[PDB]
Amino acid sequence: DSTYEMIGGLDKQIKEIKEVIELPVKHPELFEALGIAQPKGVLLYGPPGTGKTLLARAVAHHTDCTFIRVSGSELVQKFIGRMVRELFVMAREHAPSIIFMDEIDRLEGGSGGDSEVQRTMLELLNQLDGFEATKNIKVIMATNRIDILDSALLRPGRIDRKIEFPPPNEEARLDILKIHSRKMNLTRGINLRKIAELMPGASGAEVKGVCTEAGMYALRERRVHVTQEDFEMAVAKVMQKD
Amino acid sequence: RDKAPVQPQQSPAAAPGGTDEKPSGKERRDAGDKDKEQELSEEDKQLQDELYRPALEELRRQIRSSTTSMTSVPKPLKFLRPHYNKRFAADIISVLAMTMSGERECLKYRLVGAGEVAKEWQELDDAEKVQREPLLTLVKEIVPLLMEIEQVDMLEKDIDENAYAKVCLYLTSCVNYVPEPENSALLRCALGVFRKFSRFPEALRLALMLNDMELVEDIFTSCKDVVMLGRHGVFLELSEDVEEYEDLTEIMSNVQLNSNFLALARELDIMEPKVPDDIYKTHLENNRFGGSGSQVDSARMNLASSFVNGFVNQDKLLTDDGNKWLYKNKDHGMLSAAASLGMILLWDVDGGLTQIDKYLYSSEDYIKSGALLACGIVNSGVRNECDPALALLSDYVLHNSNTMRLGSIFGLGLAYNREDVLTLLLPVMGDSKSSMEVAGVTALACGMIAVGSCNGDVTSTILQTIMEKSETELKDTYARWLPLGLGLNHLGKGEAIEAILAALEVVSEPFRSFANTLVDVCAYAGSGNVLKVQQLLHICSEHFDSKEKEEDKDKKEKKDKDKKEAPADMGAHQGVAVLGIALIAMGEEIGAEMALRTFGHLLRYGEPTLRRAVPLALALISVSHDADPEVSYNSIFAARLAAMLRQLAQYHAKKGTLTLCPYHSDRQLMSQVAVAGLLTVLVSFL
Amino acid sequence: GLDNQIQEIKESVELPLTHPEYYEEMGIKPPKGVILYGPPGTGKTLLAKAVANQTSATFLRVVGSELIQKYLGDGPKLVRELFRVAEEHAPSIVFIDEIDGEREIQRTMLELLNQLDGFDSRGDVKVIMATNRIETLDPALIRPGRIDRKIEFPLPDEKTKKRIFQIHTSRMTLADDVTLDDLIMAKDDLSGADIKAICTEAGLMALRERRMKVTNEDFKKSKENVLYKKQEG
Structure with missing residues (x-):
């Protein structure tokens, strides 16, 4: 589900995005007094914020809409489907929907089939740019990895939305790390404040790096509860690759 | 802010607690409140709990008007005896008096069929004449009961907004949505506001809807005292119906004060600007008489040529294309061609006389009957052709005066x-x-x-x-x-x-x-x-x-x-x-x-x-x-x-009606070809 | 400030298929069309000028010429398909927007040049060309398309943006301090989507305090984002 109880730290950005996404949801009457239309979407460029998808699944979970991705990372690639019209038919039947690519986030064949997917979403943006079947059809890009150059280059911020997202709120390092500590078995004498604030410079992926790279020492010592010293070692275990 | 300190202030029924708690609500009433007045569960005891009663009734109608209600809101207003551009008065007057006076005027409109709604509706008249919201105070004051001089009590400064807006949307909604008994109030009260003001032609439309002689007399002395004229003479005679132009010609036959209302506004002067200007600024090509005059055959395309010639009036070549064109056609074509020369001469009474006089007292029945029809079509205010036509109509069995009764009575009916x-x-x-x-x-x-x-x-x-x-x-x-x-x-x-x-x-x-x-x-x-x-x-x-x-x-x-x-x-x-x-x-x-x-x-x-x-x-x-x-x-x-x-x-x-009668009578064409003799003399054209 | 211009070109484009007494009897026959262009471009200015013909008619929209470089050099075959479907769909209006090895581009450009002129075709449909800048394209495309008359985008004459602003604000709620001369005079080379964009973000920014009425200070405060954004790059 990944509701608001599993994502936090972007209060200003959800306060700014409720007018981009939540506008056709609960207050569509401002079309006369304001004169707004359906934009292309929104994207967040920079380091991985450990929850780049939990936000889309969160707003989509509160909008009470379906989540249909394009690349089909989890058994949703051929379930719907020239494999280009079935997505628009399911988008016509299911008017509330949020599209977010996660799997896309050799240069000869990988850019060949990946160039076929890019041409697919380009002609889909041409069909949706020319005509429109129903509302509440918006696409969201993902620029968090290094191999993402087409989405960052083709979206400079001229006819789309752009958000500077290197330093989200420092809660992408602190409070979503606390949330990632709520799921796993957490003790009561831990202080995530210092170990969460003392990881500067490297990247924003310190949450997933310290959790996943700390699971090898919680798997080595076989401790029933995760201690702060495990995360302290995980800081070095993720700073060695820098 | 936090309601913890000031929340239990309204609970004590002590008079000081009211005389200092109510002024706080009046101070915070500028924007209504910080919320939607969720304190109803704590003020429902003060609902019945009444010296300074207009303030408690004011706050009570404020909260009942704030959260929700349908009848209990205007009662503290009618009992309060209201006393005592910002945001406070703009809200509590504009939207709270908008919905408040709307539901009060509606509930009193459908409830009873007292001077409370009159004096309070005049207080809202002044308050909305100060706030000056366009077409909204109007669009809500439409149905409020009185339908009297209140408009002239409002029509002092805003003339184009109330005339254009109020008369536009209230006239369209007064002919589509509002019934006739209030439309009469639109005609009389609009006669007042427009009679006391300028823009005479819309009052002339009020004469198109009233069909009264006092409006056209007052607008002819008010428009006569202030001195173009030919235009409002043209759509003056076009707009007036059959009643007010004979009543108009009888009051103007009485005085008319100018010699220009009878002399100018008697006859031939709605067409005296039309014909020479149409001959001067416009010129039709001869390819219509050439083609439509060249493919004539089968005695029916010639009837079409009697339609073209019959309703053509710049060019009069086919008229002067020798003779026998009337004889080549049928009897209905003899009526059509005999009436064409009368339908093309709605000018030059002496010229139409010296042109139709030849067909008069002829040997054929339809030439002289269509000639009397032509004499009835050439003019509509000469009425000197009545005696020679009506003098012979009394035959009652069978005579030429039956077709001369068709043309004479038809054209004479078009004259009147x-x-x-x-x-x-x-x-x-x-x-x-x-x-x-x-x-x-x-x-x-x-x-x-x-x-x-x-x-x-x-x-x-x-x-x-x-x-x-x-x-x-x-x-x-x-x-x-x-x-x-x-x-x-x-x-x-x-x-x-x-x-x-x-x-x-x-x-x-x-x-x-x-x-x-x-x-x-x-x-x-x-x-x-x-x-x-x-x-x-x-x-x-x-x-x-x-x-x-x-x-x-x-x-x-x-x-x-x-x-x-x-x-x-x-x-x-x-x-x-x-x-x-x-x-x-x-x-x-x-x-x-x-x-x-x-x-x-x-x-x-x-x-x-x-x-x-x-x-x-x-x-x-x-x-x-x-x-x-x-x-x-x-x-x-x-x-x-x-x-x-x-x-x-x-x-x-x-x-x-002159343009509505000919086709409504023409709705019976699916019959014998006898109707084609009257089809060519329709008056629905100009 | 372009009502006489839009009615002049409107009469220049409505004479075919309508009002035929002064189109074929007198012998006008302009079977070539017109060519348009806008300095701001964006397709919304030219779309707002040619949108007067989209009211009661059949319209065709082909934006950009990327479909030639993105694939192998198939040639003008797609233009021939648009030509045969324009012949089968004569009651329509042809409009092309965003008109932007080397030996093949020249031969398909000359073939498109002769095809656009229509040597073996009389007046059957109207073709209107549009691009960002007329100076970038070769001047050879003028004679086939533009043989009647061309028009350039005027200046902020304080009447066009005033009329468009009146249409967009025919039902909006604005305060009395919101003047118009500083807005229609301060702006320069802005399309309808720019004034509509600053009005949209102005109402959306005024909605942050549940204010149904937009003030002038919030309108200029919202305009600071567009004026600052256009000067950042």
């Missing part, structure tokens, strides 16, 4: 409560000659004479022709063209129960019941009568396939203004007669693409009734897309009826 010619037409109605066109041009003559009567009339003339109509139930064409003149006499009604009287005596076998439904066609000129729309949809499945044609044909006359509701799915059915009902119901307006879109599907049909009926309204509603549809007619066609009619539409392809 005239009692002498009607009492002379009484023996004509009693005659009942075999030719239907006698009672046709007689009933239509006196009918067009009597259009616009105040609440109709139940006089013994039309009562006499109703008795004679009930005498013998033969020759149903009498039961078709007599209700024409009857309904024309019933025209101008505002509250006449004459339709119900006809629903009492006239109701009989479906012939005179068809006359009754023709009275129903001339009984629903237009008001707020949605009961006739649901009753219309309920009666749309009648077995009688003619009362649907006429009663449903009335659609183009009833809703002639609101054209958004006129297009429907009538064509998708199988009742081609209804397809003709919409085909005629198109009209003569600017001709939007929806009408021509209906002419696209209605154009292609096999029966000559619909194929012959489609080009008339096709070219009447589009009068510059004229050549391509005619090429479509040439592609579909290539009998003689469609050829004569397609050349007719080739010619004429390029709210007064």
